[PDB]
Amino acid sequence: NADSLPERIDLFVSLFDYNSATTSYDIRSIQTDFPTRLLTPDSMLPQTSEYPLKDIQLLYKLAQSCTGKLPLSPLITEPLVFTRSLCKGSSLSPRWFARSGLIHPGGGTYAFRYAEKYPAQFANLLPYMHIQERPNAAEGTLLYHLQNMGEDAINALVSGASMFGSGSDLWLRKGDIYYLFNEETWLTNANKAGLSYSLLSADTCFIQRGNICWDVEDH
Amino acid sequence: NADSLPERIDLFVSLFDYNSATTSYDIRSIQTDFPTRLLTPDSMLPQTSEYPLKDIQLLYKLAQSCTGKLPLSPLITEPLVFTRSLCKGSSLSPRWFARSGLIHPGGGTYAFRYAEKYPAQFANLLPYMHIQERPNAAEGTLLYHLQNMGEDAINALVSGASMFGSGSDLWLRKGDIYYLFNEETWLTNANKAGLSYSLLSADTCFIQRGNICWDVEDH
Secondary structure, three states, X not given: XXXXXXXXXXXXXXXXXXXXXXXXXXXXXXXXXXXXXXXXXXXXXXXXXXXXXXXXXXXXXXXXXXXXXXXXXXXXXXXXXXXXXXXXXXXXOHHHHHOOOOEOOOOOEHHXXXXXXXXXXXXXXXXXXXXXXXXXXOOOOHHHHHHOOOHHHHHHHHOOOOEEEEOOEEEEEEOOEEEEEEHHHHHHHHHHHOEEEEEOOXXXXXXXXXXXXXXXOOO | OHHHHHHHHHHHHXXXXXXXXXXXXXXXXXXXXXXXXXXXXXXXXXXXOOOOHHHHHHHHHXXXXXXXXXXXXXXXXXXXXXXXXXXXXXXXXXXXXXXXXXXXXXXXXXXXXXXXXXXXXHHHHHHHOOOOOOOOOOOOOHHHHHHOOOHHHHHHHHOOOOEEEEOOEEEXXXXXXXXXXXXXXXXXXXXHXXXXXXXXXXXXXXXXXXXXXXXXXXX
């Protein structure tokens, strides 16, 4: 019977009443509001794959003391501009952030760090902050759904996956729009299609032992 | 890198200090204490795959009124013995349950139903009751662990799987003994082996869409 699974999944997708979704989001609207950089969890970590750690550390020490040795990476020019501006007290307008690479070498964004020093600038700079740096969004908003997504759901969303689960929602893609359905609708339509399902925490499922599905950490 | 997964899983298994398990259970001890019938969730349901439903219903009506038409299935002889004994008020000793098929056609066990009518018999009859019919076991006991297992963990245990997860434990088989480790040990050794994992709720994982792993309900 496992030979029938692609057709059963097709039946499952066709059972949903797309006019009756909890809500829906055009992919173009998500892209308009959120750079991928401000969604993916790795942006919140020190950018160790982009810079030598020595450069990240020199930059932290420069920011503490507003003096000392200058990082060397030609990739460090904009971080240095940011750091030296905070040191000299010279303004960075929202336009500076809009044309910036957004992510600070120590993880997180320039905008959030800037607004920590100039809290009157916070609302103007929110568009340049990672979703995990923004305040807890109102329930039912797109930011709320994004802030509550695990890494696996963010990656599926960013990759444009045809469906993925997050929290208490099923996201189903149809065209270039995602439609959200709640868990009980997901389960009812899976029932009716003769399907069972698991939400994976790991990227993928290569080998099953007992009820554990194993993956390599590094692909 | 996924080509290396069987060797990584072998490394993972070899990282555990089996003398340092939370606890361990010889499979022979589990079998001594628990018939498979008293573990598997289907025993708690009406035995519709074993009897016509009409026979289950005739048997329920006979039990209510202690009169009326007799079920026909030659598979119904022992249920009729049980029912008529309860009707006539004639004793069923623990020895009757020990040689019985244990499971009543309406789901659950003869012993539990008998002890509902004769509560002084409850402790003598506990060995013949499903784990889901017994009182909440003391924490850390084998019954406690079994009572807290989902269907997927019970099936893995019953099938003798080399590992499976239940609750906050990893069960690892070595020889004919299961060794329990907690979640943080499981995760540490998975980390060290370069593995990621998911606990499946469905029997298996045939097709992955997004972060959902799909199975057929009926194999």
